Amino acid sequence: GEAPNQALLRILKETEFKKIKVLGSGAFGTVYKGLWIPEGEKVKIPVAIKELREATSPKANKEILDEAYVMASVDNPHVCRLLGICLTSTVQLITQLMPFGCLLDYVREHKDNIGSQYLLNWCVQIAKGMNYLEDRRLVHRDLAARNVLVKTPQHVKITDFGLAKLLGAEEKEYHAEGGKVPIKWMALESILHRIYTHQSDVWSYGVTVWELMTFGSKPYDGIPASEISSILEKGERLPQPPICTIDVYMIMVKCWMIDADSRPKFRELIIEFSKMARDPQRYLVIQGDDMDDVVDADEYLIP
Amino acid sequence: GEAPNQALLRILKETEFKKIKVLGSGAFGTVYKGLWIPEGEKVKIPVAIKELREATSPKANKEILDEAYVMASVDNPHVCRLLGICLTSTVQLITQLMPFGCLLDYVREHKDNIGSQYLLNWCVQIAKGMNYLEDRRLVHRDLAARNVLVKTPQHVKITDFGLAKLLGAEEKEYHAEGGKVPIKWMALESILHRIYTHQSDVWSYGVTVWELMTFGSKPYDGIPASEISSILEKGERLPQPPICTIDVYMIMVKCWMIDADSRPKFRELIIEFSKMARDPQRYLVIQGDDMDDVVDADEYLIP
Ligand SMILES: CN(C)CCC(=O)Nc1cccc(-c2c(-c3ccccc3)oc3ncnc(N[C@H](CO)c4ccccc4)c23)c1
Ligand SMILES: CN(C)CCC(=O)Nc1cccc(-c2c(-c3ccccc3)oc3ncnc(N[C@H](CO)c4ccccc4)c23)c1
16 A cells, blocks of 8 residues: 556667766766757757766665666656666666756855845755655655755756655654764754654755855864764754844754754745745845945046 | 147156056056055045056157146046056056956957947947047047957947047148058058048048957958058958948948048947947847757656
8 A cells, every 4th residue: 555656767778868078976986967869859958977986886786776766756846857777887877967066066156146035045946845855755865055956046956866765654764774874964863863754854954054055164164073963962053154144044943953843844944935035135144135435537526 | 729728637646556466568568457545535546557668768758748648638438538647767647447458358258248239339439439539639540449448348438549649720630750550440541641630530440340340350360561551452341240230331331431531420420320229139140149959858858
């Protein structure tokens, strides 16, 4: 008695798409920028193509395929979806290219041009995607600014479901085992007990919001991961960003409550941030949105 | 019986202004970027500061002072004016900073972002300044894109009156002697007979317009200056720029008539270009104002 997953998994021919440039290469193999040209059509779809480091690791090949299953099962405007897989020596994942890269880097290299409208609209969009994932019974487990991609400056999508997990109808949490999840974005209960829920994802959403409001600051900049558990237990949290009114900062702090159920639901976060987005300057003070006695010569008239 | 020139020549103290960066250094000494802070006021005026190469040439020091006299005698929104001179070892000229540099370089390093509206509005503004100079009885003798400066992208001013000459009420032309005037911008009669009139300046205006429409192309790119006189005599002129309709190109060609009096007057050029500026796309075809089967993945829906 569980809803059959009738997602279609498209198998693409390597000849159909053309890699163009490497976009980056972390501990997750390499991601390529490319063009997908389905033979029959008269279309050319810009795509990102992801594959693991050339060799075959048994456990890592299972995991890509697990990530394919989740990306192939999600359909929503604020969530990156799988277009298909290409079955070469190593398996390749293909998705829509998000040309402007990840949001974390974007805010960093656009501080001086990011209005409060964009910031709050991003917050709404991330909450919508997350809320969609909650509907889909999916616990992301790796929400951060670095895992949100930018299609256009006004349109961002959640991505990177390498750690995601599907919950049963008769199931409310996920108990991890292996670990190695980014400590500075995880809820306390997850650090202490390896428990992950949708409310755990809300914690991470909180930190993600903090990242954006601080234009890409690293959470707990000096602090080594070993200490994190202690300081949270004590009742320490991320500071209030300079641009943040108490109204917005209070939303952040609510995400970081010890009682997970007291934290806001994503559906609520959409409402709250939506409301704020209609009057962005009441909620984020940003100077733009070295001299002030400067006057132009054809205003300084000859005395 | 000639109108007394009651222009005021302001003498500035070197202590009042602060050089900040060199802007450039040609055969004309160096031009500095600076801030002028008149002691009594609470103002800070951005300025360009021009001085000859450190040494004193007798003939060249006379000429700076001649250029000071003309800049100090002009007052108009489309013409750069002298703010003052500073009497140091070598004499310094001071004017309003035109931060965006000269127009020639501007069009070159903004081709891909310059609309037809900007182009035609520049043409109007240059004609207005030139027409003002004609009123002031002043023959510029060195109009080119490189001698028009940019205050803002929408506001340009004529400058560089090192070759300018003042005409008498009972006087219609200027007969040069020394020469070394840029050959590729001068009217034929000037090349042949060293005659310079306001209508000679219209020729130069023509070439200046050609420069802008070709986004900074060098006139007669292959041709050495010695040949120029011949080819013009034969009836050869600059080609029609790609973006130029026959309407606009015809204005250019009219500036290059052999009979100087047949050429348009600046007052007429203001009208004509003004008219065109109200419907810029009827007069300049620019593609913006490598694939066209490209479609975004969240429009290519799974077939
Ligand atoms: C894995 N995670 C913990 C690190 C986040 C990360 O590095 N993401 C990443 C890395 C490299 C490229 C991209 C990416 C880009 C891109 C574009 C321009 C500049 C920089 C990056 O554009 C993208 N469009 C879609 N997906 C992207 N990356 C994801 C992997 O995070 C992806 C690609 C292909 C198939 C599945 C997922 C991308 C995204
Ligand atoms: C002399 N002529 C034949 C060459 C044209 C030329 O090189 N003009 C020039 C050279 C160097 C600086 C400037 C200039 C700039 C500027 C600003 C940013 C980048 C590049 C250039 O800004 C200016 N503002 C006002 N005047 C300028 N130059 C003129 C001389 O052409 C000038 C400066 C000071 C006093 C009188 C005139 C300028 C202008």
